[PDB]
Write a protein that binds this DNA or RNA. Structure first.
Ligand SMILES: [Mg+2]
Ligand SMILES: [Mg+2]
Ligand SMILES: [Mg+2]
Ligand SMILES: [Mg+2]
Ligand SMILES: [Mg+2]
Ligand SMILES: [Mg+2]
Ligand SMILES: [Mg+2]
Ligand SMILES: [Mg+2]
Ligand SMILES: [Mg+2]
Ligand SMILES: [Mg+2]
Lengths: 210, 124, 119, 141
RNA sequence: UUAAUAGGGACGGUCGGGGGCAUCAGUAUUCAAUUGUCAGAGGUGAAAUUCUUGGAUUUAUUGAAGACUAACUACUGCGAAAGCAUUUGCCAAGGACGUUUUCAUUAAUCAAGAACGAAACUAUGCCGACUAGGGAUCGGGUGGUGUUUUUUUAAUGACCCACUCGGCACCUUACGAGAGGAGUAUGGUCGCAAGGCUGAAACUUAAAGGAA
C-alpha cells in the first residue's frame, strides 16, 4: 500500500502564520493518522497517508486543508473542512466582463458597503466567503456553496446581490411552512465603409500667405 | 431600498454574527445582540434631527488609556488591511478619516470609547 | 490481486459509481444513487452513495475484481469543480466493502478556456 | 515635452563647455574636409557623416575642429541636399506607412500614426517655406 | 552668434499581453461515428418541461464545427481612448535610455473642423503655477563586487549593492487671494368614500346560499 501524498506551495508571506499554527495542524490531522510536512525552504505544504490510515477519503480533505491555508483562510475556519459536511469551492469571476471599471465595481458590489452584503450572504448560507482578485473562495455546506455560486455569477451579470439576499430570506421562511412545500414559490419570490487614407489638413493662414 | 427589514438585517449582520439558522427576526433575537440592535436602530433615527454634539457622546475615559486603545486598535486595523492588501482579499471602502470596522470593533464595543474618528483632525 | 478501475462521478444532484477494467473500455458494473433511493430529493445524499458502492462492491467480487483504482471527478466544465457529497461516501463505502483501494486521483474536466461569452 | 505624445523624456547630448579642439587632436583641418566630402559623395547624410568621424577619427565636433559645420563644409564643395534631412526622413516614413496601408486595409492604428507624421511634415514643411530653404510652390505629394 | 535640462530628425542595444496579415497549440462545450453495461439521466427548494430499452446518463477510441485563450495574472506591462494575455513568421509603427551626430526657434493652449469610438444601483478625493522625501516596482544606462555562469564553435545572460533618466501607483510633507430638512392644523376647491343579508321588485315573492 503506497502512500498517497499531496503538495501545495504557499507564498512566502504566509510563512510566519503557518509556522505558529503547524503544531495545531499536525494535531488536527493526527486524529486521522495523516502525516504532514511543512517545507520552509521550498515553501511547500505536504500531506501524506500512513500505515495507520483507516479512512481512505480523509487524504482529499487533508489536501483541501493545506489549499485553504495557503490562500489565507484562518486555521480555526480552515480546520472545519475536515468535517464531512463541509466543502470548499473556488469561483472564477474574471471571465464575465471586459471593462476593468465595470469589473471592479461589480466585485465591490459583492462585498457591499462596510462588508454588509458579504456578511449577510455568509450568515444566510452558513458559508465562509472570501473575495480575492479574479476569484471568490467559499467554504461551507454543499447547499450553501450552491447558493453562493448563483449569487456570485449573477452579480457579475448585473443582478444586484441584495435581490438574492432577499430571495434567500423568503425561501428560508417559506421552507418552514409545510402547507406550501408542494406549491411553487415563484409567486412569493420578488421579481460609410472604412477608408484607409486620411483627409488632408486645412492649411494655416501663414501658409495661405506663403 | 425602502424595505426596512432587508436593510435592517444587512446593517445589523456584523452584530448578529459576533454575538451568535440565524435568529434575525425581532422576536427570536435574544441576548446582547438585542441590546446592541436596539441601540443601533435608535441612534440611526436620531442622527437625522438630533444635533451632532448631543446625540453621540463618547464615554469618558482617562487620557493615558484612550491613546492606548486607539493605538492598539489602529495596529489591529493596519495588520488586517496589510494581510489582505498583500493578499488578494478585497476590503470594503472606508472614508479617509474614519477607522475601518473590523470584527473586533463590534465584539469589543470599542466604538463607544474610541469613537468613529479623531474629531480634532476632522475639524482641522 | 486482480485490479479494477472505479469511476466515481459525484455531482451535486447525483452520484455515479462505475467500475471497469484497466482499459476502462468494458463496464463491469454501474450503479447510480437514483436506483437506491425512492425520492428525487435524496439521490445526492451520502446515504444513496453508500448503497450504490455496496452493490458495486458485491458485483465486483463476483466477477473477480479485488482491488480498484479510483479516479473521482465532478461535473467540471463551466460548472463547479468540487465533487459532491456522494463522492466521498462512495470511496469510504468501497473500502468498508473490502476492495483494496489502489490509487486515488481527480480527473475533473478542467477547461483550458471555458465557452463563456465575454459580453 | 514630446509632440504627438505624452512622453517627458530628456535624453540628449551635452556639448562640452570649451569650444576649441582637444589637445590630443593632431590632424590637419584640411584632411577632415576631404574625409567629409568623400563620405557625402558615397551617399551619407550629414548626421551619419558626423557619427563616423566622431567614432573612428576623433572628430569631436566638425565645427570645433574645422571652424564650420558639416552642412556648410559640404555646401562649400557643391554638396547639399535637395530637401532638408529632417524633412527627408519624415517623408520617407510617411511613404513607408502609406505603403503598408494598401496591403493591410484593416490597420486602423497605422491610419492614426499617418495623421501624426503627415501633420508633422506640414509644420516642418511650413517652416522651411518661410525661411526660403524650400521653394514656396513645394507641396507634399 | 549660442546650440535652451525649447522643439524636430538621425544613429545603437533594447522593451512592450500596442496594431494588421498568416500560422501553431490546448483542454473544455456541441454534434457525429463506433462501443461496454443497463433504468433511469438532467433540473428545482419541490416540480413541470426535456432525453431515454431504436440503449438515454455514464465508460473507452476517433473525427468535425464555433468560440475562447484557465492556473502563471500582480493596487504590473503596452496603447491617444475604447482596449490588448497560446506558439512562430512577415509588415510597417511606438516609448524611454545612451550619444562630444544633425536643423536652428521651426513652439504652447486652442472654439471651428477631422481621425478613432440593455445600462446604472453607496461612491468622495480640497485645488494649484507648488518644497523635501520614504518604501516597493517596470524599462534603459554607468560603476563596484562576488556568486550562478563558463572552455579559441556562435552567442553571452541571472542575482547583490551604489548612482542616474523616464513611468504606473502608495504613504508623508513645506508653500499659495484658488478672487432648505423635518413637521403639524384645515367650517376653502376638487376627488375618493358609509350603511342596511343576496335572490327581491312596480311584487313584504320561490328555490338555493350567507349569518347564527
Ligand atoms: Mg523622439
Ligand atoms: Mg539642445
Ligand atoms: Mg530606435
Ligand atoms: Mg511587437
Ligand atoms: Mg479548433
Ligand atoms: Mg494561458
Ligand atoms: Mg486571439
Ligand atoms: Mg508582463
Ligand atoms: Mg501608458
Ligand atoms: Mg522615478
Amino acid at each position: 500500500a503506497e502512500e498517497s501524498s499531496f503538495m501545495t506551495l504557499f507564498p512566502k508571506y504566509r510563512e510566519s502564520y503557518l509556522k505558529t499554527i503547524w503544531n495545531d495542524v499536525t494535531r488536527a490531522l493526527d486524529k486521522h493518522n495523516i502525516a504532514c510536512v511543512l517545507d520552509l525552504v521550498e515553501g511547500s505544504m505536504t500531506v501524506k497517508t500512513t500505515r495507520k490510515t483507516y479512512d481512505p477519503a480523509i487524504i482529499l480533505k487533508a489536501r483541501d486543508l493545506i489549499k485553504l491555508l495557503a490562500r489565507s483562510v484562518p486555521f480555526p475556519q480552515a480546520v472545519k473542512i475536515l468535517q464531512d459536511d463541509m466543502a470548499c469551492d473556488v469561483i472564477k469571476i474574471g471571465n464575465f466582463v471586459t471593462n476593468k471599471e465595470r469589473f471592479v465595481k461589480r466585485r465591490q458590489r459583492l462585498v457591499g458597503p462596510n462588508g454588509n452584503t458579504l456578511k449577510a450572504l455568509e450568515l444566510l448560507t452558513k458559508c465562509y466567503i472570501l473575495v480575492q482578485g479574479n476569484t471568490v473562495s467559499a467554504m461551507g455546506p454543499f447547499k450553501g456553496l450552491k447558493e453562493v455560486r448563483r449569487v456570485v455569477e449573477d452579480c457579475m451579470k448585473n443582478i444586484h446581490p441584495i435581490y438574492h439576499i432577499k430571495e434567500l430570506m423568503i425561501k428560508r421562511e417559506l421552507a418552514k411552512r409545510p402547507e406550501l412545500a408542494n406549491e411553487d414559490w415563484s409567486r412569493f419570490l420578488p421579481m460609410k465603409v472604412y477608408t484607409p487614407f486620411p483627409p488632408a489638413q486645412l492649411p494655416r493662414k501663414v501658409d495661405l500667405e506663403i | 431600498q425602502n424595505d426596512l427589514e432587508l436593510q435592517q438585517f444587512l446593517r445589523e449582520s456584523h452584530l448578529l454574527s459576533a454575538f451568535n439558522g440565524i435568529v434575525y427576526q425581532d422576536d427570536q433575537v435574544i441576548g446582547k445582540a438585542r441590546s446592541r440592535t436596539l441601540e443601533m436602530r435608535l441612534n440611526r433615527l436620531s442622527r437625522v434631527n438630533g444635533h451632532q454634539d448631543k446625540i453621540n457622546k463618547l464615554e469618558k475615559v482617562p487620557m493615558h488609556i484612550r491613546r492606548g486603545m486607539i493605538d492598539k486598535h489602529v495596529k489591529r486595523i493596519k495588520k488586517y488591511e496589510q494581510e489582505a492588501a498583500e493578499g488578494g482579499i478585497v476590503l470594503s471602502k472606508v472614508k479617509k478619516g474614519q477607522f475601518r470596522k473590523i470584527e473586533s470593533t463590534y465584539k469589543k464595543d470599542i466604538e463607544r470609547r474610541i469613537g468613529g474618528s479623531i474629531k480634532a483632525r476632522d475639524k482641522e | 490481486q486482480v485490479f479494477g478501475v472505479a469511476r466515481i462521478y459525484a455531482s451535486f444532484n447525483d452520484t455515479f459509481v462505475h467500475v471497469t477494467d484497466l482499459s476502462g473500455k468494458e463496464t463491469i458494473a454501474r450503479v447510480t444513487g437514483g436506483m437506491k433511493v425512492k425520492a428525487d430529493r435524496d439521490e445526492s445524499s451520502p446515504y444513496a452513495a453508500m448503497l450504490a458502492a455496496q452493490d458495486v462492491a458485491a458485483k465486483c467480487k463476483e466477477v473477480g475484481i479485488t482491488a480498484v483504482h479510483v479516479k473521482i471527478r465532478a461535473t467540471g466544465g463551466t460548472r463547479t469543480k468540487t465533487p459532491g457529497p456522494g463522492g466521498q461516501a462512495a470511496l469510504r463505502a468501497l473500502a468498508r466493502s473490502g476492495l483494496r483501494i489502489g490509487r486515488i486521483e481527480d480527473v475533473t474536466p478542467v477547461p483550458s478556456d471555458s465557452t463563456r461569452k465575454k459580453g | 515635452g514630446r509632440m504627438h505624445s505624452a512622453g517627458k523624456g530628456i535624453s540628449s547630448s551635452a556639448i562640452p563647455y570649451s569650444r576649441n579642439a582637444p589637445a590630443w587632436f593632431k590632424l590637419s583641418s584640411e584632411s577632415v574636409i576631404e574625409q567629409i566630402v568623400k563620405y557625402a559623395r558615397k551617399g551619407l547624410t550629414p548626421s551619419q557623416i558626423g557619427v563616423l568621424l566622431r567614432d573612428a577619427h576623433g572628430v569631436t565636433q566638425a565645427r570645433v575642429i574645422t571652424g564650420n559645420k558639416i552642412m556648410r563644409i559640404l555646401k562649400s564643395n557643391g554638396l547639399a541636399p535637395e530637401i532638408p534631412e529632417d524633412l527627408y526622413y519624415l517623408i520617407k516614413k510617411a511613404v513607408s506607412v502609406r505603403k503598408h496601408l494598401e496591403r493591410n486595409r484593416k490597420d486602423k492604428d497605422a491610419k492614426f500614426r499617418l495623421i501624426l507624421i503627415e501633420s508633422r511634415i506640414h509644420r516642418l514643411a511650413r517652416y522651411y517655406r518661410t525661411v526660403a530653404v524650400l521653394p514656396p510652390n513645394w507641396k507634399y505629394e
